[PDB]
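Students often ask what a holo structure prediction actually looks like on paper. The answer is less mysterious than it sounds. You provide the chain, you provide the ligand, and the output is a string of discrete structure tokens encoding the 3D arrangement of the protein together with calcium ion.
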Amino acid sequence: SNLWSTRPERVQEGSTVLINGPQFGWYNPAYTYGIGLHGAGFDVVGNTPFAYPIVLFGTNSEIAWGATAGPQDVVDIYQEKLNPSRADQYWFNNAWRTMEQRKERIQVRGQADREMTIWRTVHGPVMQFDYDQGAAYSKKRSWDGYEVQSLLAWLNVAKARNWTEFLDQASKMAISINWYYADKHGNIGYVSPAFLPQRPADQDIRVPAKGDGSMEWLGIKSFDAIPKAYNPPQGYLVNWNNKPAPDKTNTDTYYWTYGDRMNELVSQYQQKDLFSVQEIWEFNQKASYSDVNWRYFRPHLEKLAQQLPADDSSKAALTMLLAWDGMEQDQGGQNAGPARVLFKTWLEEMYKQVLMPVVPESHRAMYSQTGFATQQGPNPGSINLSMGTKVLLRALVLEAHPDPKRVNVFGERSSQEIMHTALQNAQARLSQEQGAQMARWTMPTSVHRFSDKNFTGTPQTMPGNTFAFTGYQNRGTENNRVVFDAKGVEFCDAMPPGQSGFTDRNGVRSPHYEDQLKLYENFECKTMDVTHADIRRNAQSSTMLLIQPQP
Amino acid sequence: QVQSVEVMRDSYGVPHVFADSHYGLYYGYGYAVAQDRLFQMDMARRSFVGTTAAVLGPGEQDAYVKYDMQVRQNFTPASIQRQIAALSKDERDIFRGYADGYNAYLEQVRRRPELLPKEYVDFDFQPEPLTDFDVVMIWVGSMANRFSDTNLEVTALAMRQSLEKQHGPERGRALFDELLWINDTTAPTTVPAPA
Ligand SMILES: [Ca+2]
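The corresponding structure tokens follow.
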């Protein structure tokens, strides 16, 4: 999920522009639903994922707001020392403790009802039982018991009119998430609200904690610990699932390095001084088709061709890979150019030479993957630097800056030696695959797909009902743009394939089923009515409902 | 006690709800979602409350069941029930109005069979009335669990356990700090400007 905010001081016409692209994966019908709520204190306009009473992405004519994936740790797993005699007892403080159990009844169509038992410890519910090791893993969450509080805090942020009313609502948030601020005055802000626990020095963040009473939470950390950035001297705030702020250690699930997908958006800001609204919108144009892991390997490939002897062994594809701008180019397709194909197979051979010897058999698939977009294979809703690539990058600096305390994964062989061997192995693999002719090498272009089944593995529609177009775009599922001109409020959103997910008994579909699909492909954007004046003028249909509740 | 909820749609079929009360605002909002995406939301609640196998039955290999046990394990229904009841009158009408608004159009489906979606005919089952507990669960199952419940500790422990078997506690823990580093490189990319 990517978001980049701009301050009027960095904009030509002097308007606050907030563009958000949250990526959850592309599904049919649309993942996000557009709504404009007016009255009872609320005066908001925009769209929200699934169907939540709250609005994640939109504006209230006073301030806009975006969102991304949570980059902070809130969930810890504790390993309880199980009794060697009894399975339901665990060692907690002094002495033994019995687990709590509750029975859930699963209803199945065509078959009898299935029954299961869920065990619970002092920390939380268990996820995995290991009987031969004598340890059970329980899941303790910091946001547990504060589900509705985080739901309502996200709701009341729509009624807010300033940064101080934006910040105190974030203090009520328990779940790990990122919030973004942009007002009509010209101010932009960022906060990462979460109920952060204060862990002891004995506890390692990457591995499970001791569930015996010796290693427990000291308490919930204060709000001052939560990272917050309001109006940076640079005049822009960029976040693409990257690190929250400097001073925060890596979580158990997310690991970051100097090579990050954030640099794909930020590098566009260090070109010109002032950008127009149309130009800032065209940041998504380049970031979608640009390669993520190209900016960091290119300097490490320049010192290759030279002073490397021009004896043509190989240097055949190495000199060409340099003429690559790091972009997907369709022609058939079929990628226009053998540069991406060679670079893909080069990285795959780099994992074989360095990582596979040290990485165990079970976790070998976590580092062998290159993390590239493909035509047929089920690719994720967001393309990233793979864990195999991240280790290669930070250890490549370790040769330039030696450290005795750390161990080098390259070991005996230098950087230039391994990168040469991988280049020879990549060329040898493609020579027997697509012929000896180098110029004719090409890989099938990645197809952008809208799957009928959602993220969790449940069909949202009938099987087969899918939309697909050639050319994978590293965008969000929904792209919103809030521009605060001198007028000055303009909301513009784009969500494929459309608003209505209705299909008639005969087979015909709603007119608002495919109306936004073609608009999304061309990086275009639709205007949405914000104020009470123009909504009654640009209305297509009106329906009045009647309610009679009992207070 | 009778309130009117005026729902108005634009050129791209996007609803705009006008009301005066908390119950009324989310009644029209609940009514609009039922018109556009009825089957999508019926399958949404089941994905997070754990009732997918009730209408889809067993998967090619108990895929809808094995999963149905996984989702029920993650949350506790008793803990959420207290949290909803603890809310005030105006706060509860947000979820109740959403449930009653969705059921308003749902009750109209029984009256006129032409309003029934195609997906209900193909999968061969009848739609169910939405409750206030379901509305909360749709947010808790997708938001907070799939973004604030991401855990990868047990797999990290198994890797460190395997590395200490082949290389010992000296080299195994040294190689573990290279593959899964405790702290990121001191020069990464951060949102706030450093220094
Ligand atoms: Ca943790």
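Chain A has three domains: 1-72+146-288+448-528, 73-145, 289-447.
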